[PDB]
Scaffold this active site. Structure first.
Site, short mmCIF file in Angstrom:
data_model
loop_
_atom_site.label_atom_id
_atom_site.label_comp_id
_atom_site.label_asym_id
_atom_site.label_seq_id
_atom_site.Cartn_x
_atom_site.Cartn_y
_atom_site.Cartn_z
N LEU A 150 51.06 -40.43 102.95
CA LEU A 150 51.41 -40.31 104.35
C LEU A 150 50.11 -40.73 105.06
CD1 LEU A 150 51.30 -38.84 107.31
CD2 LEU A 150 53.51 -39.71 106.51
N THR A 193 57.26 -42.83 110.45
CA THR A 193 57.50 -41.40 110.65
C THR A 193 57.76 -41.02 112.11
OG1 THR A 193 55.17 -40.81 110.63
CG2 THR A 193 56.30 -40.82 108.53
N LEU A 239 58.30 -35.82 112.12
CA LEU A 239 58.30 -35.27 110.76
C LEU A 239 57.46 -36.08 109.75
CD1 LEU A 239 62.09 -34.51 110.92
CD2 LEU A 239 60.33 -32.68 110.49
N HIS A 240 56.18 -36.29 110.04
CA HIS A 240 55.24 -37.06 109.23
C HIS A 240 55.29 -36.73 107.71
CE1 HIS A 240 53.74 -38.71 112.93
NE2 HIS A 240 53.10 -37.61 113.34
N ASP A 241 54.75 -35.57 107.32
CA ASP A 241 54.66 -35.16 105.91
C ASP A 241 56.04 -34.93 105.27
OD1 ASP A 241 51.97 -35.50 106.39
OD2 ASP A 241 51.43 -33.42 106.05
#
Ligand SMILES: [Ca+2]
Ligand SMILES: [Ca+2]
Ligand SMILES: [Cl-]
Lengths: 316, 317
Positions: A150, A193, A239-241
């Site tokens: 990420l 993302t 919601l990156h991760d």
């Protein structure tokens, strides 16, 4: 059952990812390795240990990583994004569980050498521990099954400044080492993302759900959602991760493009990620020539990703 | 009533097409050509600008020779594999009879802008060295220039010199950074825009068969240019870079623009990289994009309208 090491700086969305990962039946979490970024490394270790206890898995090893980037110096941490404690200012009591003795770099080398070609690494923070493992064991890249990162902003604005995404900016030298290592790498940038969100309505739906960690997740997300409203002008969270975790289990919800990725390590564009798609024949050699290409997430099936994330977050 | 325009350029095949187009535009008064290196060495660009003035039947139009090197110094490598050894597709034409003016391009820019304050527009078709030199030498230059329309950069897109950088910016990154932060009324047209605008082999044949005043000369130059596009980009025809930035001067309504601070990377692997801060995100602290005056960056282009306008000028009798 895929063996997975999560390299992380928890971190509000890192925390959501870790709790989702513990509920995923096709995944075997063999360890959490910690790094600075959203919070100092010691604070990330404290959170990782608390998450293991919360998930009912305090036996899962937590290995503390580097306190500073490869270039050295006390890192600037995103306390304005994830709170003073790294988890939205919940100020929870200390864990009873303790970290393992070995460093995150040694833990990564040991587990990957124990099961060659079987252990995947999900990198949710600056890439220091991964780069340290690559430099200390030059066969590390070839033994790791896959590294899902990420990080970065590909033909898009950064989130630290216009040039750079947070994880890459945290350690640009480490990211450049990882992207040119020759390992099977999948990079999911914020260009991807930022298309995947939880609105205020989605967060309220989580609060009202029968989710095992629904109440804790909602509480943590308040501070994170507030930063999004103040900075991005968005009423909810990106919601990156959790999206990079979705890329580990469901790469079919994305399309990827192969290309050499380099990281700028100096000047005004420090931490900028740039991919050569290879669609143009260059007249002469350049910094993107001769390296092994990696996989860069290009498109995302937003409803399929959201549905998968929501079912893990709302699972009783 | 005509708009005064100075063209700063490295002719160059698409530069040569733009200059001939500009001489045929009735709403425009070309008050001078200022030369720079890039597609060819500066001396080669001066030779071409003088020949173009003669070809257009305007040898009285002043040609002012500019810098032979970027602000950081050193003899620049030129795009001879793109525009030929003579910069115009290896036509090896006899030398011009017309002579360049005594003053440098930087002094010519300062003088004309000061002579006609708020009236002179500058169309920059090459590296930005002469424009940066005028900005540095005259601190009132940025306030007296009407507009600076720049062909350069690659905004959230791959460069054309390498993945990071577009040719004009890579030619002089320091000069581009000086221009983009000068506070002048600037319009930047990157290759993210101009690579959407093309002339096919069929379009080129249509030009060759037209009643265009310079049709035969234009087609002859474009033969070498087309061969490079086929070898490098895998495209059968040519991209229209410099003619598109000229279209932005006369018809800005064929484009949409976004305002934002633009910075240029001057060192490392991303040397020559252009990056704009759109200002849609509130930063926690100051960064290299903070405090500067925003400029206009071309965001979208009405491709049929731009092609029609370019074709009209190239095929005008
Ligand atoms: Ca993280
Ligand atoms: Ca040019
Ligand atoms: Cl840094």
């Amino acid at each position: 059952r895929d063996k997975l090491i999560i390299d992380t700086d928890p971190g509000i969305d890192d925390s959501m990812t870790i709790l989702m990962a513990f509920r995923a039946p096709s995944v075997e979490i063999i360890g959490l390795t910690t790094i600075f970024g959203n919070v100092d490394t010691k604070g990330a270790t404290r959170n990782a240990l608390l998450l293991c206890e919360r998930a009912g898995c305090p036996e899962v090893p937590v290995a503390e990583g580097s306190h500073e980037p490869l270039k050295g110096g006390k890192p600037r941490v995103a306390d304005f994004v994830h709170g003073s404690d790294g988890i939205g200012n919940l100020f929870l009591p200390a864990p009873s569980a303790k970290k393992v003795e070995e460093s995150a770099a040694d833990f990564l080398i040991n587990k990957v050498s124990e099961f060659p070609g079987e252990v995947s690494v999900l990198a949710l923070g600056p890439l220091t521990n991964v780069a340290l493992a690559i430099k200390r064991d030059p066969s590390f890249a070839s033994k790791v099954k896959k590294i899902v990162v990420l990080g970065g902003a590909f033909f898009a604005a950064g989130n630290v400044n216009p040039a750079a995404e947070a994880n890459i900016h945290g350690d640009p030298e480490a990211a450049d080492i990882v992207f040119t290592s020759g390992a099977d790498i999948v990079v999911v940038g914020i260009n991807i993302t930022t298309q995947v969100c939880l609105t205020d309505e989605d967060l309220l739906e989580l609060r009202n759900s029968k989710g095992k960690h629904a109440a804790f997740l909602y509480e943590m997300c308040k501070f994170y959602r507030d930063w999004h409203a103040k900075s991005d002008g968005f009423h909810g969270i990106f919601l990156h991760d959790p999206v990079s975790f979705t890329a580990v289990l469901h790469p079919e919800y994305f399309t990827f493009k192969k290309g050499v990725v380099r990281v700028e390590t100096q000047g005004i564009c420090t931490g900028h990620t740039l991919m050569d798609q290879g669609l143009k024949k260059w007249n002469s050699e350049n910094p993107w020539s001769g390296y092994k290409p990696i996989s860069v997430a290009w498109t995302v099936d937003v409803p399929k990703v959201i549905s998968f994330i929501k079912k893990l977050l709302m699972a009783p």
